């Protein structure tokens, strides 16, 4: 399991770059961070 | 201050989003289909304002290079699930308004990192997708 939301989101955003290659769509994953303390 | 972080930000996204939103123009060129961008958001910002701020740069970044037609953003959030789903109707009226292009927020909490659950929210997520290209 996860212990973390990062991990869960990671997880999912793998899972549809990675499962919608027939898809209506070109899906593109990026992330973002908010560099600051 | 804010201003360095935003600073550091665009250094990411032309480091980062530029390459991976390059390749998207290419493969939705082979094959004629519009791009969504997919956009994994930390839990570590110190505000909801420069969250938005943001998110409505790495959006419009990508508006500029890949003229995405939806944007789906996962916001990671350590919590229930009820908070995360206002949260993310939150930020979603936000980006909405800011960006001019269908946007779908969608908040995530580390349970929902269960491979049945995401099952779930794939689901959900491309039936919205499919609404936004076909209905």
């Given at each position: 399991?996860?212990?973390?939301?990062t991990?869960?989101?990671?997880?999912?955003?793998?899972?549809?770059?990675?499962?919608?290659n027939?898809?209506?769509?070109?899906l593109?994953?990026?992330?973002?961070?908010?560099?600051?303390? | 201050?804010?201003?360095?972080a935003?600073?550091?930000?665009?250094?990411?996204?032309?480091?980062?989003?530029?390459?991976?939103?390059?390749?998207?123009?290419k493969?939705?060129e082979?094959?004629?289909?519009?791009?969504?961008?997919?956009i994994?958001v930390?839990?570590?910002?110190?505000?909801?304002?420069?969250?938005?701020?943001?998110?409505?740069?790495?959006?419009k970044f990508?508006?500029?290079?890949?003229?995405?037609?939806?944007?789906?953003?996962?916001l990671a959030?350590?919590?229930?699930?009820?908070?995360?789903?206002?949260?993310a109707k939150?930020?979603?009226?936000?980006?909405?308004?800011?960006?001019?292009?269908e946007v779908?927020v969608?908040?995530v909490?580390?349970?929902?990192?269960?491979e049945?659950?995401?099952?779930?929210?794939?689901?959900?997520?491309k039936?919205?997708?499919?609404?936004?290209?076909?209905?």
């Amino acid at each position: 399991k996860c212990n973390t939301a990062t991990c869960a989101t990671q997880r999912l955003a793998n899972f549809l770059v990675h499962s919608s290659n027939n898809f209506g769509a070109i899906l593109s994953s990026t992330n973002v961070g908010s560099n600051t303390y | 201050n804010e201003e360095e972080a935003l600073e550091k930000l665009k250094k990411y996204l032309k480091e980062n989003e530029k390459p991976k939103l390059e390749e998207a123009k290419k493969e939705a060129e082979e094959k004629g289909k519009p791009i969504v961008h997919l956009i994994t958001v930390e839990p570590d910002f110190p505000s909801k304002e420069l969250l938005i701020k943001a998110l409505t740069l790495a959006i419009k970044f990508a508006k500029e290079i890949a003229n995405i037609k939806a944007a789906v953003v996962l916001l990671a959030h350590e919590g229930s699930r009820e908070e995360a789903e206002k949260e993310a109707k939150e930020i979603q009226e936000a980006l909405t308004k800011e960006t001019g292009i269908e946007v779908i927020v969608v908040g995530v909490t580390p349970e929902d990192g269960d491979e049945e659950k995401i099952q779930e929210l794939a689901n959900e997520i491309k039936n919205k997708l499919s609404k936004i290209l076909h209905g």
